[PDB]
Amino acid sequence: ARYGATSTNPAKSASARGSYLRVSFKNTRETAQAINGWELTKAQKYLEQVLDHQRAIPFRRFNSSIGRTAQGKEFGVTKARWPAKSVKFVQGLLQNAAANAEAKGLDATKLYVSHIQVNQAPKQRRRTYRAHGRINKYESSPSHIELVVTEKEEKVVRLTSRQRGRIAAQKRIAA
């Protein structure tokens, strides 16, 4: 429980989450932002195409020294990638959210991803031995993922006495 954001009228929404997921936080954030606000079925088809390398996930924030591709022109960017592990985790959470919505009885064709949020889980701290007998950190940055899908649904003015007199005079002059 205790999501980052909830839905008013929770009877027309479904939620899914996954904690301490051993997947790259930055790649997962890029995947979630690429999916934010989309319809559920369209988003799932887009993720399948990304796995098939027909479309790509645009990288907007964590994108220093990344290669350039033509598949970023759809989103008006030059830097896009195909993070398979992040896409698989997000696909699992989307499937769980769709199952939750179906169990609630919601219409599956009107669902859209109204909320999705990625946070940094506590880091997995391996260590590596380096030259001159050094120990350096070697850390996995896991992710907390949450998402909510939602059904799509379809002045006294006070005046002064002068203003009142002017309006009355205009009314008298006109019909």
Partner: peptide
């Protein structure tokens, strides 16, 4: 819609 106002 989506809100951050919840009541415990």
């Amino acid at each position: 819609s989506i809100t951050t106002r919840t009541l415990s």
